[PDB]
């Protein structure tokens, strides 16, 4: 069962993965680090200093999304675009566990928990960051639009669930 092989998913991927430029390649390569788990420890330390009330919600939300993301990654074991499709523009050598996008889920988890109760321009900054991570995964050729949409969905839900608890 390959859930990534429907017309809307493949046509959307081609539109993003083919609209390229060397400056986009550099920007998204530099930007990808902000969607990895390597920002979590630096971020949590700064939260502990300036926004300690957000530390516990973010930790619980990241735990929720991480468990949910690795579970779906293991059960579905979907191929990434470099395996399913031909002539994929690849920025990172990733091939498997496509569904869903963990970087997108974490980024939307960060944006959901940290936007709560904050000024409007802070919400726009965080959710533009989350959007660019999701766009970066498709531009890098390592994810399908289905992976980043569900990943974003997981991140938003787990962030909201954590804020309520």
Numbering used by the authors: 1 to 165
Excerpt from the paper describing this PDB structure:
The selenomethionine substitution of the nonconserved I63 residue (I63M) was designed to enhance the selenium single anomalous dispersion (Se-SAD) signal for de novo phasing. The overall structure of LpxEAA contains seven α-helices, including an N-terminal amphiphilic helix lying at the periplasmic surface of the inner membrane and five tightly packed transmembrane helices (α3 to α7). Apart from α2, which originates from the periplasmic surface and penetrates halfway across the inner membrane at an ∼45° angle and immediately connects to transmembrane helix α3, the remaining helices are oriented largely in parallel or antiparallel with each other and perpendicularly to the membrane plane. Looking from the periplasmic surface, helix 5 (α5) is located at the center, which is surrounded by α2, α3, α4, α7, and α6 in a counterclockwise fashion. Fortuitously, a sulfate molecule is found in the active site, which is a structural analog of the 1-phosphate group of lipid A. The sulfate group is extensively recognized by K73 and R80 of the K73X6R80P motif and R137 of the R137X5H143X3D147 motif. The catalytically important H143 is located 3.3 Å away from the sulfur atom of the sulfate group, ready to carry out inline attack to remove the phosphate group of the lipid substrate. D147, the last residue of the R137X5H143X3D147 motif, forms a hydrogen bond with H143. The first three residues of the PSGH motif are conserved in LpxEAA, with the central serine residue (S101) serving as a helix cap to stabilize helix α5, but the histidine residue is replaced with an aspartate residue in LpxEAA. Our structural analysis of LpxEAA shows distinct features between LpxEAA and Escherichia coli PgpB (PgpBEC) enzymes but reveals a surprising structural similarity to YodM, a phosphatase of phosphatidylglycerol phosphate (PGP) in the Gram-positive bacterium Bacillus subtilis with a weak in vitro activity on undecaprenyl pyrophosphate (C55-PP).
LpxE is a member of the lipid phosphatase/phosphotransferase (LPT) family, a well-distributed family of lipid-processing enzymes also known as the integral transmembrane branch of the type II phosphatidic acid phosphatase (PAP2) superfamily. This family is characterized by a conserved tripartite active site motif of KX6RP---PSGH---SRX5HX3D and activity independent of Mg2+ or other cations. Removal of the lipid A 1-phosphate by the membrane-embedded phosphatase LpxE strongly protects bacteria against host cationic peptides and the last-resort antibiotic colistin, significantly dampens the host innate immune response, and dramatically increases colonization and survival of Helicobacter pylori in the gastric mucosa. In order to gain molecular insights into the structure and function of the lipid A 1-phosphatase LpxE, we identified the previously uncharacterized gene aq_1706 from Aquifex aeolicus as the gene for the thermophilic LpxE enzyme (LpxEAA).
